[PDB]
Amino acid sequence: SMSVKKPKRDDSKDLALCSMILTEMETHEDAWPFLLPVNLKLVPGYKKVIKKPMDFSTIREKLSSGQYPNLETFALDVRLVFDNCETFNEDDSDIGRAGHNMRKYFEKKWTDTFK
């Protein structure tokens, strides 16, 4: 509350560390469905169904331009990429499996870097 604060967690490396995680996600072999925005002209149904499209390149641009206020808003966008994927793709598809794999990969890096 006012003049009553928990001890100050050092957040000075968060930007660099989120960048490294995102590099690792970018370079994973199963990243290909997620590297670029889904082409809304060429994928029927996507525009209407997926209310907030997100992809790695859009996260990278947001990161690099100070559009994440903190590490939680960065995690929310990464998770959005996978939630979108699950919304549109059957589990039993290459893209559906890619999404599950990437989410797992991300959540472990997240816990190990920050928890």
Q: How was this structure determined?
A: X-ray
Angle at 38 between CA 56 and CA 22, to 5 degrees: 5
Quote the CA–CA distance of 87 and 74 in Å, as a whole number: 20
Domain ranges (residues) in the chain: 1-115
| Helix locations, the chain, DSSP H | 14-27, 46-49, 56-64, 71-88, 94-114
Q: Are 55 and 38 in contact (CB under 8 A)?
A: yes
Q: Are 56 and 32 in contact (CB under 8 A)?
A: no
> Any idea which architecture 1-115 has in CATH?
Up-down Bundle (1.20)
Quote the CA–CA distance of 24 and 55 in Å, as a whole number: 14
Quote the CA–CA distance of 97 and 103 in Å, as a whole number: 10
